[model samples]
Target: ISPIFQGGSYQLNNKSIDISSLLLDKLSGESQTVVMKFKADKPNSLQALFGLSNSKAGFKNNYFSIFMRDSGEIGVEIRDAQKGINYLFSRPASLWGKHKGQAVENTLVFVSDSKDKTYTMYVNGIEVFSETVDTFLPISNINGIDKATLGAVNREGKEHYLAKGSIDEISLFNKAISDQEVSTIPLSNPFQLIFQSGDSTQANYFRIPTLYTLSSGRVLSSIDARYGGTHDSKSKINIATSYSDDNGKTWSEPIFAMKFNDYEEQLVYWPRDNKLKNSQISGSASFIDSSIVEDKKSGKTILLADVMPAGIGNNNANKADSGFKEINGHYYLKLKKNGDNDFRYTVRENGVVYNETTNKPTNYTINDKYEVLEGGKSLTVEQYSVDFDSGSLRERHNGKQVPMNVFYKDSLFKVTPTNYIAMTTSQNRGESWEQFKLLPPFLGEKHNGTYLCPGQGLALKSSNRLIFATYTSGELTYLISDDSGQTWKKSSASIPFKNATAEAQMVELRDGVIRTFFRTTTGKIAYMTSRDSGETWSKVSYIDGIQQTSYGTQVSAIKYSQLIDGKEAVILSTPNSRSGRKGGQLVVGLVNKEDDSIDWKYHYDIDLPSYGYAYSAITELPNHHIGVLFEKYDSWSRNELHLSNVVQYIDLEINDLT
Candidate 1:
């Protein structure tokens, strides 16, 4: 049902939508009531549903406003500049409906009684809050009230907390509305929550979403199942994945695509701390930041993740070690025995353990389980369980233990405490994956560390090649595969910017013209192009239209096959606010064919500038709809470490965006 009798309905765009100045004359009374109907396109920290003030008056001390706080709590503010009086009231309830993908309409009623010195608020015919003040100033007592507006309030000489949706209808009453009158107001779902932080009551946080669609029309999403918290490394993280056969309407239960043996998956409370190092769980091996891509020729879905040893993080990783040893010009997975100094043993071609110094085979061999085999017998080792509150690892299960993986630090054999890149391939439509194989730290001991770009990879349309964006040794890098996942090489093409190492997403604009959009510390999104199938790259430049938080956040960009508004386009998902990871916007960039320039057009809001947004991934579904999976909170702020934070999924229609 729609409200009858309306003047002019205004749409909000972070600007003032002023109505008649005559409303101020009505406010010069002992009591007043205001009823407003509106719909919020996105939830913000502050949005003025209805406001009254004069352009000449000081807004902070004279204006009156009914606003909605972040996540849709209703708040009322009244002030008198002459009397130095200010009153603020809030109700802890949300008008932001259950479904994030769909908008919901709301009706709000507010009443003030000067005689009783009381104020009341109602949302959709239900009284939410009522309070009596110690000292009250009548509406007429407010100083300098000449201007009136909807969806915004003038404060500090400018508009603040402007709404980004529609204001349906507003009604004013000279007298305070009664409870019986408030009982008559009226009101009004689609993003799927696939992976929440505490999904299995084990993992406490989840971050870094990667979504991709296979050739068989199945969609897959993978993320870091952070058991310790959302902190990047030196924590228990595993690559957990879920698949959907029905275009995301439903998803299979999440499975561990890649896991480490050091820590068990269990729920733990990660407290907010100023020093993150003090909160890290000890002895926790991790596989973090996954990137997924499917090979057209081989029909195999390849997944890549950054491998981290127990207690090692990106910032503190050993730069000189690449976790490999060169034995007579052959690269082998090196290992050092417990209590030994020199790394003399290496796992050779067929998992055979060879003593590099003696050039002879030992009784030890690595098996398919990555277990150390002595005389063909699998070696057993004790397991470690973490103390959640203390962040300490303790041996569990008494003497009863399990087979040891060579990568386990507590085992007799162990890898270097440096970061490495690992890869696994799925051949049966994501039902199962082959054993993970470590990519030779392709930087050849020339880099500090390497990481996948944490989104979807791109395959050249013009040639038989696959390129995944990467960063290593303080440079933007690319992992290019010419033989379709069989072999890979690294390209450390120049990035003409400083501090360029972070997560990035790449899309093939057209065949050999590849554009990689990455996060930069300069609070802007930067892009670089590759004209020779990622082997060579053009000068790096910034996409002025897109902005990110200063600390940086992951973004998602994809080439849409169909034309949008008669031009080829690339869809980008990112948080457009520089102050924080808020203001989730999906932008369509119209690509110029001749010069390969981009016209960033048709931006749509997934959420407003107050709801936290970060680490986004996007893919085109089989039905041509856009699928987006993103972290729905501020991943950078340490104080906002909310447990069970959600990784949300939504499908957007192309026509609506255009």
Candidate 2:
């Protein structure tokens, strides 16, 4: 039986001695013993005894007992009327302290070998200490075998010295348990078992099925299992991938797409010292928005995944103001991506690539130096660097010894800014991708500090229409391409939500309506609909029962072979934390024959270990089989980053509810 702790000490047995009273007692028997098990949180002491002493007789051949010490020590002590205290044993000092936020099992045992006059004690199945005593204690007073108290010794009126932890499984025996028997007894592991009710609870809904279809009239589906990956502070990026085939019925294994691996490259000027060793680094990458489109001009299937790169590294600048530069005395500039191919200014309008030689834009070049016209007069400029010896400036034009001015505007400084590029692939329907070609920024006009991450996009059945969703920061932004992925036009209007990010999946209904399901920071699944091609969107609404933290959501939709009440259905995969562990679950929602609003009919909980699982993708196959993919990791050691991409196939059938 298991017991939960409330506040105060509870008596396990009445005849064992008033553990709450301070009075000590001795037993008459030569060989008698008692044992108890307890759980604790803080550090405290416990004592047990067997003795014979009354109000009239002083005391006689009686034994006294103390099983544990106040200093968080587990031990046993024995005392006799004739020999006094004789035996004491304890565990090592380093092992007895209390551990917060953990459950500890403690066992105390007492043994009295009167024929040999030996006393022994065991704690947690191990005999901590044992010794021999020459005296034997006799039991005289019956007094109901002495009442046992939990927190204090049993005196007439004594205050309680309550144990700070919990107590359970108190036992008594006439014979001592041997060392082998003690070793064989099972001890609890460090992990605790918390039981609520008798069975596990169900998870809430947070994502909806956006697409489902069976291929060749078979119940088979293709799914991609790539989810979130670990981010390292050293590089500014993280990379993961996914795949789907069998119609959304079974998924191929996830592939590690890319990761930001950062290493320090020393400057030629700074002196190397033991104190300054490792350079700071960071890296993270997200599938900003992805779309599968057939090139209208080429008629070839192409997959486009937009990516964002963000990071910061350590430098010698002491103050924030020291890092800012002004160009044309108009826009303030800060250097980004100091030693990498992707470089952009925080305030610049466009990103430019350098032509290698003069660090100038390939399209245009300006003189390296220009005079600053401040107050219609020239002012002297000073230049500074962390390494004083390497801060000198050079004049590269006219072969004239002009005094170096640190504050001169650089005309030849091309804005070779690096921005997130749309990566395209035409091989085997996204099975592999070629080198990336940077596309012009697709989100036009409203660039108000709105960041866009790559999201899932797909080609429509029409063969010409491709749909992809993005978010400017958290606002939903979308794009469409009629001529395939060669060019894109931003869809007018945005999905309305506060604190939104573009981590979403899209599915086309039989009626040609498009439904997109996305996760929100508020632990709910929100969705919108597009009725007229991809031009406009419906207002967002919450899907009941779906809940999650703001890290965003992942979804996959596929057509199922079986129909509920003769209507087709879609299956969705999402990570549900409502049951803790944030494990993934598969839900089936019906598709309205007339409208795209989901018809809530079928829901079943998928059972997986209560570890963290997220980033799900799914597909339906020709044989009415469903496939799913997701990411999983240990909840305790999240930093270990043991991310695994998993795929599973499932079969579903619709039945009538009589």
Candidate 3:
């Protein structure tokens, strides 16, 4: 329903607008339609958005009401002489966790067809459920006192199932609307839900959204689909991907781009303390924090993610070991046999294994799925399962067959518990990808392994260089490629910070001058410039226009192809709250052509500080619009475990930032 005041909104809390007189002559037909736009402050109970009531009886009166449950399930109840409160609910809880104060606006449309004896429900412009009922009791079929109310049901001289939130608009129709009509209704929510939590993917948590618009106008979104909980590690997680061909309006179903078969993805309620003992699927090899970049020269899109061994994270990972051993001037993935202390096995080409001691081939082999095969047959092993009650993961040796992974210690061989970077390339605008390639520790033996900074990379338009940011031992660095990703080298540029810095994004300001923006332990964002194609750098500088919590959040920045306010501009996205991650803001930094310094000019807010806002990525759309995919939750607090419901997508015009 369009807001009566032309996009105006009102707050609702035990307060409703009685529209009995409006429905006097209306709703006379057998079919009916009701559409409303609103968001609840709380999702736990039966919060009525709008309803139709009658004066026929007392408490058990005939009525039709649409309500929401705490689980984000929307249902309707209709009472008549033959049918006692016939109910219908949507299968997918599309509204779950939307009450997080930071929730995007939602639209609910209910349409009933008397001739077909069926009803359909749509949420956020998508048809969620449709059912044919034995007793179709439309509002016109039930004889009511001609009472209608917005935000609650008025019955027996009292308000029931009161709503506590904001209601943008409510509309009542005498005749049923077609599915196409419902789809045309404009939605108040600017962002669409992509990669929702608790979806069929069984991912209880989603984090680190990385979105990039390819040269073909297709937008790709990659995220860490965490199943165990929101914790960085010590849980089951996979790198998932979804793409949109028509801008950011609709997205394809997500697919696991990279995953770990050692431990299955399960819903585990991580404890508040975040103790490893209370975590499920604790040792699952995981691919987390995905980043995507397209090579404008080669027309190939590269996806990079951090690969963690079984039961290891940034904090607990062995920084000294890179899981690769150099032999005869060649590098091979090293492995240790079960119950053996020293490394004794090396994974050779084509899943073949070689004994490092004997320098000869072994019977055991490692497959692409990380499965250790005996000869040519699959090797079965005890599977790791998470206990629901205690949140503990244990190996069930009772014939619960599981694939043996080289990373699992209990398997025939194990790799070093260190982090590595996984890379894959897609030549067809992210439709399909090539086999996963694990990049060796590019920093060599002196420093810890490198991790892909969780955002999009930069392809220098002026040169053949492609650069993606990285952090080695919590210090900002870069993985630069000069020959279209055929060969790579670590950037010599460095940024000194008072504390730690990680997760950075790069933008080609002018020519090959690259600016790297990164999050820091301080509440401000820090950036540096590489004037010579990432071969040199400038001093670190923090953005003073916006501030977040000391536990800084990941930020996204991209160069706009067009000029804003008669100057070249780069858009940066991040939370602006000084206390916590909230109040997401997009700041436009106008470039100074003389020195390439930025003049932080205009700023626009996507949400307020009262709601959750953290970890956002931005890209320039085909039409020069800015597309954003962000986490609408307070990731720093971790107080609300599994707080992120879905990674949200939205597109904004250049004027919005101005």
Candidate 4:
């Protein structure tokens, strides 16, 4: 017997054999058995192996074998030369069983003996099964063993089963192993997460949550608030918020972070007197509503909301209406840094302002007018206007109201209808409350307007710098805050793609590189990185396996996690149509050192039945658990009004695949 040969396809030049027809002359007639091994590296390689075989040869007497890994499982098969039939000898308990948690070296052995006319199979050094046959009697009679090949075996120009691992060692034995030797190999146990539901439900939707760490080292939680109530009701929609104390294992109940309600009413009028020809105006009307984020910089958490109030009743009809009304609300944040406490109360129709009497906004200004009803017609008005002297709306006599101008120059105040960033300062860890100020424009000419949706902004903890990721009239815009929360400067940046928007999360890498993740109109997650803070950025690249619709997807705050083999890893929640469900997928991957490529390691399927989930956010907790929040819904019945919110948790573990 010859010493065992140790070789693999990875080192093809030094280890593999060509087994050409002429080479077979060297091994004409030796009685020693030839054990050839081969491996299929990729899916195409597997197909190539089957194509090499001649199916009609009826060469069952000759021994052939193959081993492979598929869909995280391992399987072994064998064919007899005499019968030319295939047999599945052994299969691992689970798809991920053999290599669960980590990757390890494996072994397969094939022994043949002409004298006994038998072949035996061994996996990890143990014999699994054996077969005896005599179809190769003519070739066995030769004195010297002729054509022996490694990496590939030839039988009538037909190479059936090709292996898929390193052919570390091959030994030719004249005798077979005893039954005891065949039973010594160890078997790996199956590993998988058992879903509580025996059957996968359509009700389960995908949830992707991104996490962030605040300046105080607390894990701040965020999510794409989805649904809360019915599909068509206003109270049914919005994004939600929650926090975790232990890294992310458990979570608090999702609080109604934001919601909008439609209020409808009829107008009623009471004439002061028939002779006076004047009527007192009073009526209940409905309004289409929306909400904004809770500003935390101030001593009190200020909740901002907006609504477009409409006058119902018989008095107002058949006229061009504003269509939408915008209002703001405020609340105090009074919980421990990581505690879940209700927002301390009060609603402010306008931005919060200092109240000298009660030292707080004891009574809020219920209404701010953009236009007022005068002489049965709507005339432009101001939030801070006098009874007769209009604040800023141009008068017909003064020539201030220019023709075709959407706004009047004489309106009491110059209201920039652009999106604004609101901020507040917390002098004592959210113990008290104070009003907030709206930051300046993010981009456009000095007079242009800008608007931003919730989750479009990002706050960096490194220098307490605030960078609002927004778009101005469809162009990408950025607003930088140098002072913690005092002032802001607006500027613009050129993104490579047109019609691109930034509703994403920004993460600062260990090396101070900042990476932003946002979706594009093309339905892919695109990224741009800045090495020198937020001043400049590299070209954008697409993150594979992420898909979305024309409306796009929402990303959570990006933060570092110790879950991936102790290496810095990024967790993203995305909707993956790759699997056909087109629901949600939670992906974890490492950022490659070169080209910033991402190496995806694991994917979890989210159960989204109604396909109503979107606009999500994520936060990692101190306990290593992950908390995800997102908007849930069934349809676009109410469009902006119907939304629900959901929170979920995931445990993190490193998969050691060496």
Best TM-score among the predictions, by candidate number: 3
Q: Please provide TM-scores, in order, for all candidate models, with all chains considered together.
A: 0.74, 0.46, 0.74, 0.43
- Kindly report which residue stretches of model 4 are placed more than 4 angstroms away from their true locations once superposed: 1-419, 424-433, 444-453, 456-462, 496-501, 563-567, 578-582, 608-612, 632-658
Report the lDDT tens digits of candidate 3 across residue range 63-136. Answer: 77887754455677776545475554443244523322355577878888898988787777756556778867
Q: What TM-score quantifies how close candidate 2 is to the native fold?
A: 0.46
Q: What's each prediction's clash count?
A: 0, 99, 3, 89
Q: Across residues 1-658, which tens digit of lDDT does each residue of candidate 2 receive?
A: 1111112233333233343133223223446555556654343445432222221233322323343443334544333334443445444220122222234566566565666666666654445345564544422222223434453333333322334444556544444555565565566522111111111111000111112222223221112111122222222222223334434433444332322211111122111122322222222222233334334445454544433322321221121232223445433223332244532432233323233334454332122222222233333323211222333321222222222221122211212222333445544443444544444454432232223323336566655776666665436666677765667677644555665554666667654577777766667777787877767888777778665655555555554546766677766666666533344556677777675678756554443223344555455534444544333322223332312111223333333110
Instruction: Supply candidate 3's per-residue lDDT for 609.
Output: 43
Clashing pairs in model 3, backbone N/Cα/C closer than 3 A? 43-70, 54-145, 283-311
lDDT per residue (tens digit) for residues 47-100 in model 1: 877777644634467878888867446778888767778888775433443234
Relative to the true structure, candidate 1 reaches a TM of 0.74
- Highest-scoring model, lDDT: 1
lDDT (Cα, 0-100) at 236 in candidate 3: 75
What is the Cα root-mean-square deviation between model 4 and the actual structure? 23.1
lDDT of 1 at 301: 87
Full-model lDDT, candidate 4: 0.37
